[PDB]
């Protein structure tokens, strides 16, 4: 499961234009955070091809996602 998720994230990021990359990165983190609750930020960056420096950003987005879902976000639609 996690490896399929990482492939989907990589396909989305590799396809994003430069000026949409940061947005797409954050949206992919939010999209899958609820299926990756058990993973470390380090493992997330390794799986997706991201610099390990982005780990804190994943940790932030994973916390944010719980509150966005409570406000109606359906992460399947991202």
**Which of residues 15 and 63 has its CB atom nearest to a second copy in the complex?**
63
Which range of residues in 8-16, 20-28, 36-44, 46-54 is near a second copy by CB under 8 A? 20-28
What does each C-alpha distance from 12 to 22, 48, 50, 72 come to in angstroms? Answer: 12, 10, 13, 23
Q: Name which position in 8, 13, 47, 75 contacts a second copy (CB under 8 A).
A: 75
Nearest CA-CA partner of 58 in 19, 16, 9: 9
User: Which residues in this chain contact a second copy in the complex, by CB under 8 A?
Assistant: 22-23, 26-27, 30, 60, 63-64, 67-68, 70-78
């Amino acid at each position: 499961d996690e490896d399929e998720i990482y492939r989907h994230i990589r396909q989305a990021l590799s396809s994003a234009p430069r000026n949409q990359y940061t947005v797409e990165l954050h949206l992919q983190m939010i999209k899958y955070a609820d299926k990756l609750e058990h993973i470390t930020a380090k493992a997330f960056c390794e799986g997706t091809g991201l610099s390990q420096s982005l780990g804190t950003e994943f940790s932030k987005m994973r916390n944010l996602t719980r509150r966005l879902k409570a406000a109606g976000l359906n992460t399947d639609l991202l």
